[PDB]
Amino acid sequence: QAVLLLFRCATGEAWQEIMLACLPGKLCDPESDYNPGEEYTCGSNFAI
Amino acid sequence: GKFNFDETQTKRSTFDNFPQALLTVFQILTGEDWNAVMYDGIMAYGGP
Amino acid sequence: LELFIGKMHKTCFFADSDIVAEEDPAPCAFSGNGRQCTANGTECRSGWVGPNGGITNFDNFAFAMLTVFQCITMEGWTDVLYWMNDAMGFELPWVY
Amino acid sequence: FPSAVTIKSWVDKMQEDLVTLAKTASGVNQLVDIYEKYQDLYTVEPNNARQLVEIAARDIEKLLSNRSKALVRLALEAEKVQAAHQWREDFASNEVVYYNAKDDEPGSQRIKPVFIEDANFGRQISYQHAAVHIPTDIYEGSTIVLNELNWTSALDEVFKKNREEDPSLLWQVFGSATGLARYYPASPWVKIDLYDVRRRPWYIQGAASPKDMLILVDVSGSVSGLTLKLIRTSVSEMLETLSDDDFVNVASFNSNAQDVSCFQHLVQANVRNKKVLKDAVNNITAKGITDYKKGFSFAFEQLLNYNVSRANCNKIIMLFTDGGEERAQEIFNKYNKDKKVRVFTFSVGQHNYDRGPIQWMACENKGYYYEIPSIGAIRINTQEYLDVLGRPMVLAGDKAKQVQWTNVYLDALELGLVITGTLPVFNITGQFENKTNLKNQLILGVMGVDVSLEDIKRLTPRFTLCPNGYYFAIDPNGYVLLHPNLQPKPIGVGIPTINSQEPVTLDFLDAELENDIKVEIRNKMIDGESGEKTFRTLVKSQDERYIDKGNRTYTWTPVNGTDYSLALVLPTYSFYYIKAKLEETITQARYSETLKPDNFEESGYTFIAPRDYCNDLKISDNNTEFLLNFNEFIDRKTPNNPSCNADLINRVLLDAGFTNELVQNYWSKQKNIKGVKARFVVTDGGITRVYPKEAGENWQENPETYEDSFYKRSLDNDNYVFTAPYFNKSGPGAYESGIMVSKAVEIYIQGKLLKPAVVGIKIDVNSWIENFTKRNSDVMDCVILDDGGFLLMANHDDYTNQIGRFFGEIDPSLMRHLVNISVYAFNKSYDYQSVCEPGAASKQSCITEQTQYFFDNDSKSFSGVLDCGNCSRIFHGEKLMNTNLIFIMVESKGTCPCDTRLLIQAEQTSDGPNPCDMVKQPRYRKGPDVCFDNNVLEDYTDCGGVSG
Ligand SMILES: *[C@@H]1O[C@H](CO)[C@@H](O[C@@H]2O[C@H](CO)[C@@H](O[C@@H]3O[C@H](CO)[C@@H](O[C@@H]4O[C@H](CO)[C@@H](O)[C@H](O)[C@H]4NC(C)=O)[C@H](O)[C@H]3NC(C)=O)[C@H](O)[C@H]2NC(C)=O)[C@H](O)[C@H]1NC(C)=O
C-alpha cells in the first residue's frame, strides 16, 4: 500500500493533498501504543 | 451556457464567455482534471 | 468488460428508502468480498446509478473504452482503482 | 305485498312500546314534578341578552386597555433610556450582565436564575430578571449586540412595575431591530432553533403598514440553474412576511409578462392564497429573453386596478432579477412620475452581470437594493424591506404610536392560542436640539404583550346559559377571536403528501354552518354597528353526525376600545335560568351527603363537571379523583365561601338533591326492568347519575354536561332522541351498552319555559330484537333508522351485527335513491382543523369535508318504487310519531343483485374549496383606517447599492 501510494504520487494524482493530510495535527489510529489522553500527535513537518 | 444543470453549485471551469472558455481549454490542454470537464459536457447533453 | 461488468452499481442507502447514506457514495461488495457499509442504519442493495453519475463504469464497450482512455492518460485512474477496490475484491483490481 | 294501512298499524304498535317505556323507565314526568314541587329552593331570573353583551364587551375593553397602558409605559421608557446611551466600543473591562436563554464570553457575563415553577404558565419562570434570546445566526458579543444589551437592561425595572399592578400579565417582550428579543419573566427557551423576532407576525405589523405588494420574477434564460432555485426560495420566504392585511400577487416576464397563477389580480394573501402562490412559484421554468419595459408595465397595471379590494396603502414592486442593461426610464416616467410606488430590486445568484441598472431602478423610485448570492443570505435580506417602509411612520411622531392586536396564533413559548399587542419604539437621540435626523428614521423595535384567549374566556361566563348558548367575537377581517369551534391546532391547507408558525385564522363562516342571514349578520358586526336578530337555522351537533333545526337570537355590539365586535348566540327557552338560593346549613349538608363516593350503592354512580368551583380546588381531567377533592373540600371549609363563588356551587348542590329525590322516590321502586339496561340523568348544574352502578362503567360521556352531544340535541328536539352507537370496535358499545334515548324535561314556574335537565334510558338491543319476532327472511328487508340515517336495529342477523353504521355504507341503492325522494337532505362543510394520515406523494393538519343528514319534509307516509335497472324493488317508509326514528321496509337484495357505490358519511380528506374563484367574489371585509406612507420629509438618499 505504501508502494502504491508512492506510485500514485509519481503519477502525480493528488500528491499535495496527501502531503497536507500528513501534517502533525492528525488523528492516530487506535492501535498504536500511544500515551493515553493524547491522540492528535502522529504526523510530522517532514512530510513537505 | 449549458453547464447549468446541477442547481446545487456553480461550476468554475465552464465555457460561458471567451476568457473562461480560453482558460478551460488551457486547463484541458495541460491535462488537469479534464475528465471532470468531459463529464460536465456529457451531462449537458443528457447523460450516460 | 469480461472481468468486471455492472459491479459498481450497489451503494448503501438507508433503511427501506431510496436515499443514499453518505454524500460521497462508494459501492459495496458484490459478493461479500469488498467494502461493507456499516453505519447506524444502512443496508446496501443494487439500483445505484454509478460513481460519476453512470459515466465511469465497465458495463458496456463504449463505457469500457472511455474508462480505459481516461486511465491511460494518468488522469483519475486512482479514482477508478479505488471504486473497484470498494465494489469488487481487493487483490485483482490493482493488477489491472 | 302489504298495504300502507297495515304497515302504519304495525308501526303504531311499535313506537307505543318505545315511547311508553322511555316515558316510564326514565321518569321524565317525575323529575318535572320534583322541580315544580318545591318552587322555593331556587328562583327564576331573566337572562337579558342585551345586558350581557354590553357588560361582557366592557370587560374585554378594560382588559385590553390595561394592556395598552403597559405598552405605553414600556415604549415611552425605552425611547427615553436609549437616547441616554454612549455607544462604547470596549466591553472587556465593564462587561454587560444578562441571562442568555437556551443555554445550559468575551464581553458578557451570564446569570444563573432559580426558576420556580408557576401556575398559569407551562414552564419554570423567574420574576427576578428578564431573559434574552439571541438567534443562532447572530453572534452575541458583537459591538451592535452588546450595546443593545446594555441600554435595554433598564427595561427590567419597567417589566417588574407592570407585573406589580397587573399580576395576571403574560409575556412582555421587546423585539429589537438588531435581532435579539428580551422578554419577561425569564424562562428557558424551548432540533435546531430557527426563531427570529423580526420575522414574527406581531413584529411585522408594528414595523410597517399594510402593503399592496406585487412581485416581479425574472424567468428569462439567464436565470436557469442555481439562480432560479434561489429566486424561488427567496419569493417563498418573502411571502412569509405578509399578513392578512397585505395584498400580494406574483408575475413573471420573459419577452412577455404574465401571471404565474390563477389569480390575475391582487389577493388577500391569507394562508390559503399564499399556498397557491407558493405552488405556482415552485413550478416555473427559465426560457426566453429579458424585457424590463414589458415586465414593469404589467406590474404597474395591476397596481392601478381599483375594481378589486385592496389595502389602499403601501404600493411596492419587488424585482427578482440577476442583471441586465435596460433601465426602462421611459416606463418609470410614464407610470410613476410622482414616485407613488416604491421599487425594491434584488440581485439573486452568483454571476458577473451588470448590476448598474438594477441599482438605479431602486433609489430612483424610493426603494432599496439587495444582494442574495447564497442560500444563507435569503432569510436576512427578504425581511430588511420593512426598514424602508417604516420611514414614513417614524416621521408621523405620536400619531403612529397606536396599539394594534394580531390574529390568534400559537405562542412560541408553548402557551396556547394568544394575541399580542404592538407598539413601535423610535430612535429619538439628539432630537432635543433637532440636528441629527440621519439614522433617526429607523425604529428601535416593537413592544408586545400577550393576552391569552383563556383570559378572554374568563370575562364571558357561560354557565348561566343553556348548553346551546355561547359567545363569539369577530375580527374586522372576519376571523373569530373567540368561538366554541376554535381549537388549539393549526389550520390546514390542501392535502398532506410525503414521499405552527402560521396564525390560527378561522373565518366566522367556516367556524359554523354558513347561511344567507349569517352572512348579513357577519357584515353588520364587521362595520361596528350594534343590533340583534332572531331567526331559524339548522345547527350542527357537537359531533359531525347530526344536524337539527332550531331558533336562535343573535345579539351583537362592538367593543369600543378595539375593532372587535362581540356577539351572543342565545337560543329560545334560554332567557330564563334557575338561581339557587339556599342558606340553611343542614339542608345544604344533606345534599352534599349524596356526593360521597361510598354512597353509590343506593344513589347510583355520580359524575361532576370539572368547573372552576373554587380557586384552591384543582381539576384533574379524569373525575376519578376530582369528586374526592370536591366533597372533601366543602365540608373541610366554612360554608361562607370566602374566596370562591357561591352561585356556581349552590347550583350543583341544589341539583344534587333534585336528582337524588328522583332515585329513591321513583327509580328505587323498580330495581330492575326487563327492557332497560341503564337509567341516567344529566343536569345543568354539572352532575350526571346512573342508577345501576355496574352499568356506570359504560358511561363514556364527558362529565362536563355542556360538552355532551346528546344533551345539546335533546334540548332542541321537542320529542325523544335516539343516539346511535359508534362502529368498528370504538370501545365497548355494541351490545353491552345499549341504545341511548333522551328527553329534556320541561317545567313552567310562572309561565316560563325551562329545560334544566335531560333524562333517558339505554334500550337493550337484545330485548329490542325480540319485539320484531313477536326474522332473518330472504324475502323482505326491515330496518329502522334515526334522524341521520344510522341503523339502530334490524331483523337480518347481519345488519344488527353492523350496528350504529351509516345506511349508505350497507345498502347504497336505497340510500342514494332516498335522497332523491327528498326524505333526507344534507349539507357539506369543511373542517379546516383536522388531522389525517398523509397519502402517497405521523399525521398532519388537513381539510376534511363533513356531511350530515336530516329529515327534510314533515310528512310521514312515504312510498315509492326503487328501480335499480332491469328489475325493481318496492318499498314503504313510515316515520315513528313523536320520535326522530323512521321505519322503512324494502324488498330483499336477493331479487335485485345490484350494488351501487357506497355512500360514505365520514371525514373525507379534501383539498377544497378551490381558491382560484373565491378571490373573484371575496367575503366582505374592512381594512385598517391608518395609512403611513409617502412623507415628503423622508430622506431615501441611500440607494443601498452605493455602499455595496
Ligand atoms: C440611534 O441613532 C443614533 C444616531 O442618530 C445611533 O448612534 C450612532 O451609532 C453609530 C455606530 O453605529 C456611531 O458611529 C460612530 O462613528 C463611526 C461611524 O459609524 C464608527 O466607526 C465604525 O463605524 C462602522 C459603521 O458600520 C462600524 O461597523 C464599525 O464597527 C465602527 N468602528 C470601527 C471601524 O472601528 C464609530 O465606531 C461610531 N462610534 C463612535 C465614534 O463612538 C454614531 O456616531 C452614533 N451617533 C450618535 C449621534 O451618537 C444609534 O446607534 C441609533 N440607535 C440604535 C439602537 O442603533
Ligand SMILES: *[C@@H]1O[C@H](CO)[C@@H](O[C@@H]2O[C@H](CO)[C@@H](O[C@@H]3O[C@H](CO)[C@@H](O)[C@H](O)[C@H]3NC(C)=O)[C@H](O)[C@H]2NC(C)=O)[C@H](O)[C@H]1NC(C)=O
Ligand atoms: C451601560 O454600561 C455602562 C458601563 O457599565 C453603565 O455605566 C456605569 O453604570 C454604573 C452603575 O450605576 C456606574 O457605577 C456607579 O454609578 C452610580 C450612578 O451615578 C454612582 O454611584 C457612580 O457613578 C458609580 N459608582 C462607582 C463607580 O463606584 C458607573 O459609573 C457607570 N459608568 C462606567 C462604568 O463607566 C451604564 O449604566 C449602562 N447603561 C445602562 C442603561 O444601564
Ligand SMILES: *[C@@H]1O[C@H](CO)[C@@H](O[C@@H]2O[C@H](CO)[C@@H](O)[C@H](O)[C@H]2NC(C)=O)[C@H](O)[C@H]1NC(C)=O
Ligand atoms: C360604546 O360607546 C358608545 C358611545 O360612546 C355607547 O353608545 C351609547 O348607547 C346608548 C344606547 O345604546 C346611549 O343611551 C348612550 O347615550 C350612548 N353613549 C353615548 C356616549 O352617547 C355604547 O353603549 C358603548 N358600548 C359599550 C359596550 O360600552
Ligand SMILES: *[C@@H]1O[C@H](CO)[C@@H](O[C@@H]2O[C@H](CO)[C@@H](O)[C@H](O)[C@H]2NC(C)=O)[C@H](O)[C@H]1NC(C)=O
Ligand atoms: C374595471 O376594469 C376594467 C378593465 O379591467 C375597466 O375597463 C372597463 O371594463 C368594463 C367591463 O367590460 C367596461 O365598463 C368597459 O369594457 C371598460 N371601460 C370602461 C370605461 O368601463 C373598468 O373601467 C374598471 N372598472 C369598472 C367599474 O368596470
Ligand SMILES: *[C@@H]1O[C@H](CO)[C@@H](O[C@@H]2O[C@H](CO)[C@@H](O)[C@H](O)[C@H]2NC(C)=O)[C@H](O)[C@H]1NC(C)=O
Ligand atoms: C344546507 O341544506 C339546506 C337544506 O337542504 C339547503 O338549503 C336549501 O336550498 C334550496 C335551494 O338551493 C332551497 O330550495 C331550500 O329551501 C333550502 N333549504 C332550506 C332553506 O331549509 C342547502 O343545501 C344548504 N343551505 C345553505 C348552503 O345555505
Ligand SMILES: *[C@@H]1O[C@H](CO)[C@@H](O)[C@H](O)[C@H]1NC(C)=O
Ligand atoms: C384592569 O382592568 C380592570 C377591569 O377589567 C380594572 O378594574 C382595573 O382598574 C385595571 N387595572 C388594574 C391594575 O387592575
Ligand SMILES: [Ca+2]
Ligand atoms: Ca491530475
Ligand SMILES: [Ca+2]
Ligand atoms: Ca437575462
